[PDB]
């Protein structure tokens, strides 16, 4: 699907090399527009990167570092926007790509790269790279970005074949004839921002951003601001228009929300609509999230000083805080929804700052939604599961660990997960690895929880499956479909038969049983104490003391009662609470 999210890992070492590349493949296969940063790092010689073929635009910056691979096929990339920048300076950073026959990047091959709207270029310590010293970078930088830094190292360990003789000014991205830099700014007639040629009638419209196949606002190679169904525009159409006489708001039916550099009739799945017409991943100040009956969340206005919210890591007062710890565990007391993330790390426990004791973890027993991510790299040996989050229902992943993962469990050796209420990972990837004693992984129906095709479970080095089956560690037979989060009848995704509390069971106690029960939506629920259990029949029709087939003791119609109330009554012949004759 055309728009993917990016990552945010900078130069940090991926913790699971064995799955690192499937994460990139999953993010990027089919993606044309990276809503974030494109970071390609720690890739070995034999890494196939064909899934990058379709990328045209990168909203953030592009980072290519510590790779032994020889080619990154980014030939379709037209435009880097530089919304964020590597080291707050660079839109493109190519660093340390080469061995510490042979390996390392040989040619950038960015032949469609015509526009860098903000930021500059850093290229350092690439032993086998050629042609980079050839490029007229000032042509690629936007008019308002001419003073972008360019810090470029040309130290190589080999000789370069010249640019193909096809190349105009001997400026190229590679030795091939399709690798000549095409210039779109410095070679233009008049004051033209971008042209497709030397004439003044080649010249692109003022709303295009990288070039054009013509003079119109529908002929742009990229939009400088917004794409409105094929037309590049300065802004989208407002959701509201004003009555020419009275100025009452009128819903504009050509109305659109802003999403990245697009106009859209509805924000996409995990995003929030604002009254301002944006699609955001977080309400801007003094707003509250409001959830329609569609499950479709809006950022509406605060009608007063807004209620209190539980922020998690990376929000408000917890913005700069690394881990959940003893110092801040009470911050979560009584929270049902956390705006932000929760990260548990070795320092959470092995502390000045104390050790977070396992029982304090119960604060999260009331937790149903996390809007950021959940990351666990440490967890007390004495707890076999993640049941303190039994009631967690959804992780949105509007913020993801390393830009990538919405759920992450590693180095724990818990024994099962037990996140039994977890029904949705709204976005982001699930990385579960290096949990020696962890079974019940493939017992979870992962893709019932995922919401878009760029999501998957990456898992390696947990307890091996044959070792789980060889100890009878499998879903209890009452769980439907063979899907569960741990051992026993409480851990099922759905009971085949009935539910008593959290326990799946074969039969409620309608006919045989110590405390007799009725049924309600495949639940076993108690008959009132004052119902006499009936041999060979149903004992009760519901919870209330007046839904017995017959009374255990006395009756004060309509209710079976333990004793007649002292407004003075007494038991008569047939057990009925008659009133005393004198008060």
């Amino acid at each position, epitope marked *: 699907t055309q728009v993917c999210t990016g990552t945010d890992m900078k130069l940090r070492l991926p913790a699971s090399p064995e799955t690192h590349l499937d994460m990139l493949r999953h993010l990027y296969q089919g993606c044309q527009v990276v809503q974030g940063n494109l970071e390609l790092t720690y890739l070995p010689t034999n890494a196939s990167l064909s899934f990058l073929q379709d990328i045209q635009e990168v909203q953030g910056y592009v980072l290519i570092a510590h790779n032994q691979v020889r080619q990154v096929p980014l030939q379709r990339l037209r435009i880097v926007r530089g919304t964020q920048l590597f080291e707050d300076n660079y839109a493109l950073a190519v660093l340390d790509n080469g061995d510490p026959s042979p390996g390392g990047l040989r040619e950038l091959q960015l032949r469609s790269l015509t526009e860098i709207l903000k930021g500059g270029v850093l290229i350092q310590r690439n032993p086998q790279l050629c042609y980079q010293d050839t490029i007229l970078w000032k042509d690629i930088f936007h008019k308002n970005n001419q003073l972008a830094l360019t810090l470029i190292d040309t130290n190589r360990s080999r000789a370069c074949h010249p640019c193909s003789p096809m190349c105009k000014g001997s400026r190229c991205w590679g030795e091939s004839s399709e690798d000549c830099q095409s210039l779109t700014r410095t070679v233009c007639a008049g004051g033209c921002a971008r042209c497709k040629g030397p004439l003044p009638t080649d010249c692109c419209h003022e709303q295009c951003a990288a070039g054009c196949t013509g003079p119109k606002h529908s002929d742009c190679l990229a939009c400088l601001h917004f794409n409105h169904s094929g037309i590049c525009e300065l802004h989208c159409p407002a959701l509201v228009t004003y009555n020419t006489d009275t100025f009452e708001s009128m819903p504009n039916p050509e109305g659109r929300y802003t999403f990245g550099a697009s106009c859209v009739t509805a924000c996409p799945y995990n995003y929030l609509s604002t009254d301002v017409g944006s699609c955001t991943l977080v309400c801007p100040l003094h707003n509250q999230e409001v959830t329609a009956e569609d499950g479709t969340q809006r950022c509406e206005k605060c009608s007063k000083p807004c209620a209190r919210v539980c922020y998690g890591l990376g929000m408000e007062h917890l913005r700069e805080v690394r881990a959940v710890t003893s110092a801040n565990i009470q911050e979560f007391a009584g929270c049902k929804k956390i705006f932000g993330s929760l990260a548990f790390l070795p320092e959470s426990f092995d502390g000045n700052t104390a050790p977070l004791q396992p029982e304090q973890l119960q604060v999260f027993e009331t937790l149903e939604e996390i809007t950021g991510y959940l990351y666990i790299s440490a967890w007390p040996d004495s707890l076999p599961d993640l049941s303190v989050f039994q009631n967690l229902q959804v992780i949105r992943g509007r913020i993801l660990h390393n830009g990538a993962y919405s759920l992450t469990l590693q180095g724990l050796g818990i024994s099962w997960l037990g996140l039994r209420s977890l029904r949705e990972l709204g976005s982001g990837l699930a990385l579960i690895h290096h949990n020696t004693h962890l079974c019940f992984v493939h017992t979870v129906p992962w893709d019932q929880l995922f919401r878009n095709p760029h999501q998957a479970l990456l898992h390696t080095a947990n307890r091996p499956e044959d070792e789980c089956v060889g100890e009878g560690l499998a879903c209890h037979q009452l769980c439907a479909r063979g899907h569960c989060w741990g051992p026993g009848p409480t851990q099922c995704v759905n009971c085949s038969q009935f539910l008593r509390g959290q326990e799946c069971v074969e039969e409620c106690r309608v006919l045989q049983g110590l405390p007799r029960e009725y049924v309600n939506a495949r639940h076993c629920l108690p008959c009132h104490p004052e119902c006499q259990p009936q041999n060979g029949s149903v004992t009760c029709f*519901g*919870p*209330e003391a007046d839904q017995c087939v017959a009374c255990a003791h006395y009756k004060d*119609p309509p209710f079976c009662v333990a004793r007649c*109330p002292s*407004i003075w009554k007494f038991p008569d012949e047939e057990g*009925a*609470c*008659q009133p005393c004759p004198i008060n």
Partner: antibody
Amino acid sequence: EVQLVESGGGLVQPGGSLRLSCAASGFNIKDTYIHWVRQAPGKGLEWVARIYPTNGYTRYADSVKGRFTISADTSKNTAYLQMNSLRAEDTAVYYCSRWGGDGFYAMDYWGQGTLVTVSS
Amino acid sequence: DIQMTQSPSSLSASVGDRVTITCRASQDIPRSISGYVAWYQQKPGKAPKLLIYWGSYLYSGVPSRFSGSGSGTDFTLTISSLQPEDFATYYCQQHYTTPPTFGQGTKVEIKR
């Protein structure tokens, strides 16, 4: 003293929805059951629903079953009746009544009634 | 369930005369409902007033000329000295079972 006051009732289209509110006063409804009885124009009294606020247990006449939900917010000392999917036959005047004390299950106190008409 | 069936459905008496509405329970869970029936008075548009509870006990504020008797599954509300105020529909109710059901109503009218 003691009373109840029905409110939030009037006019609705066929297949519509409305929320009757029954404001208790002069006693706390945790101590007893609260009833909705309705009366069509020039017809008898039809019991519609009960609730025991303490635990929220509810019972319904078969006619309204799975269309009118009755609930009770203990904090306010008030009882509600969310009608959905209003049929034409639901056109009547709606009284909320209480049962009395613990062992006294006659409808001793009643409200004033609000009219509810189902017609476009 | 239980059906309550009042009779007559309507009547017309003169001031001071004795009036007698009956109510008849219908079920196959019989026993003896007698002491678990109530009577209510309703005037056009106005909300019902409780008259009698537990079969024969007179509710406060209600004139003594109103009385109620019963035994088995057959119950009787007498009005021993009809007054012009007494124009109304009178209903019986049982709360021996749930839901508690009302009779069809007996319309009283003053022969003048």
